[PDB]
């Protein structure tokens, strides 16, 4: 038997670790040969020597249970995974954990070797460093995070964020959280340009230092900057499975799953992470929880025992520390519960990834 | 000098305590002669002997610095507070903390003495007890909380909730929190009736046991129950100040305040709590924070020192205990922060009120 995991992100490495613990034969497949803590990618492109902490070699940990490859198709009837080099992997169980894609520097999903990947980000740090005037296109989570990490490292640099809606960030965040985001950006000195779209986006020289660039909006507004960073429009990454399930995807590219995280019409295909069409925020935190359920259900498949049901409201959360970071803000109430915000760890959880992967964090 | 506080709720008693600590002369004015932990009112009307924990005598604590009265007008030019018994109180500083009003059992803002108030709720417990079939009108926070406290105490009772929108609870809650509310109600056995409004609401016999009552909606739908509980439409309570500031209120009845919580055109009137028009969730937790700022600024008024600014994002929150209740759910992320839900204390924070008021909780 063989569990093939397509996608070695937060979901895929959590499921690969467990399958290794359970001694279940598997192959993890990913475009890169290293994992990318994508949550800390924006910092990786601003702070020197930091991208080295955001990429972990797959083969040091998983050995020959890893195969670098770009999946271009899935044959669910013959149970084959089709790579772009013409090769095929047979599976008994398929876990799809393809996550989300979008422009560099926020996402980095391409065929590339760990050293070039790190050096792609270290080149970006130095082009940021050269630029006194930076435009960041797009005001979602990637754009906001990019803006704030520039003024963090370079408080005197002029950063500008342009966004096509009325408020920053994601509609499914509280209008008072979006507004809080607007105000954390203003406190840092980031100048905003809301409700207007860049025109001729395609013609911009991006990720490079270029003195006196002129960006025109659709409103005719003009700003002059020394560098454009593109943070427009992160989508679910359906490239690996669109040909197989295209008719049947959700509107946003995600896969429909039953309560055991199996694909609607298949007992031996599962989806986890961003690519699963679940009514819940697409986070790395949940992808690990999805992984836990899907490996459970592969084992129960083997032992002809009842499948476990992914309970979205899993209470697997405790303040990371013991009064070392107690303070929290209150943001709402409803029956039995209180909406609260807490601060993200300052290392952006990188230490966890190195632990999951069983490698010393480099220095 | 005299600080007159109109409204002795969470805001008003927090500001009265502090003014007593600061030895600043004040008069607290409230309709009732007891404070009402309104957050635990719905439980008070379901669980026997519990309403006695939700009302605290004002005069045991504040003495003659308390005056029972219903304020019917404010003269901000002569600095007079006008009571319904014809009497007038002069002030040097006015704190308006009038909160929110709406139907019993959720709110209880009327001229009444502590013992009748408790006995009004203990009568409701017994009418709930008599009823096998309960309709709760309205699916906001009061309706949802009422539904869930009935099935809590009486798991076999049939409770029905009817609401006029598409999802339970408040639009400014996350669509996945509203949906979580929908599902906490379904897990308890509460039958929902969404997107339809009761017709002829006025003709219903409410808060009383009446076998075989027939409620018709505007859709023509019919349900037969033994009791109607009304939880429709909590508004800001502008009764004390509408005549003075009517032209100038916000759309929802709240008072516009500067960053020091003073009313727009007055240096000696402040608003705190629900009645302040601040971009933040109307909670008891924030009203105490508003109180802290407004008493600070009355002192700074006395010492000709700079006014403090109410920072909405005040980080005055630490998990109530030390690992005694660590687990929390994750519900989102944005720059620097994580949306999390935590469980409300099971006593609904009643102990705090008795502490603030310096009285032994009765038993
Ligand atoms: C700015 C920002 C900040 C964030 N912060 C947080 C945070 O603090 N906490 C949090 O929990 N979440 C956070 N997130 C969300 C988080 O990054 C994602 O939800 C998470 O990465 C989902 O993991 P995954 O396993 O589903 O997929 P991913 O981690 O996106 O991994 C998918 C993998 O699949 C591979 N792949 C895809 N298609 C193919 C193919 N055809 N062939 C081969 N390989 C393929 C890709 O190369 C990639 O390695 C943030 C997101 C952004 C943009
Ligand atoms: C079901 C439900 C659950 C809730 N749960 C929570 C929770 O867990 N946590 C939380 O923080 N918040 C919670 N809230 C919100 C909370 O109850 C209110 O935000 C809070 O009471 C606001 O306090 P306040 O001081 O502004 O006014 P209130 O506590 O409403 O007090 C106002 C007072 O003013 C008096 N008054 C008004 N007009 C006059 C007048 N003209 N003359 C004399 N006296 C007058 C009234 O008698 C009343 O005593 C909940 C609300 C509901 C409905
Ligand atoms: C970066 O991905 C993430 C994790 O895995 C490394 C987490 O464990 C967690 C959970 C951490 C707790 C303390 C909330 C979060 C929130 C997360 O975003
Ligand atoms: C009932 O009113 C309330 C308070 O005062 C009694 C609080 O202190 C608090 C704060 C409690 C912490 C632990 C979140 C909340 C949430 C509240 O709702």
Numbering used by the authors:
A (entry chain A), B (entry chain A): 11 to 373
Sentences from the paper on this structure:
We report the crystal structures of cFSP1 (residues 12–373, hereafter named cFSP1ΔN) in its substrate-free and ubiquinone (CoQ1)-bound forms at 2.0 and 2.6 Å resolution, respectively. The structure of the ubiquinone-bound form was obtained by co-crystallizing cFSP1ΔN with ubiquinone Q1 (CoQ1) in the absence of NAD(P)H. In both substrate-free and CoQ1-bound structures, each asymmetric unit contains one cFSP1ΔN molecule, and their structures are virtually identical (r.m.s. deviation of ~0.4 Å), with the exception of a loop 327–337 at CTD, which assumes two different conformations even though it is partially disordered and displays weak density, suggesting a role in regulating substrate access to the active site. The peteridine moiety of the isoalloxazine ring is located in a canonical active site for ubiquinone substrate binding (hereafter named ubiquinone-binding pocket), which is mainly formed by residues 293–298 of α10, residues 327–331 and 354–362 from CTD, residues 340–350 from CTD of the other chain in the dimer, where one CoQ1 molecule is clearly buried in. The CoQ1 interacts with cFSP1 by mainly hydrophobic interactions with residues forming the ubiquinone-binding pocket, including Ala294, Tyr295, residues 327–329, Phe359, Lys362 and two residues (Val340 and Leu348) from the other chain of the dimer. Moreover, the head group of CoQ1 interacts with the FAD through a hydrogen bond between the O4 atom of CoQ1 and N3 atoms of FAD. The mutation of Leu329 (Leu330 in hFSP1), which is positioned at the entrance loop for the substrate CoQ1, probably reduces the binding activity to CoQ. Notably, in these two structures, cFSP1ΔN molecule forms a dimer with its crystallographic symmetric molecule. The interactions between the two cFSP1 monomers are mainly mediated through its CTD.
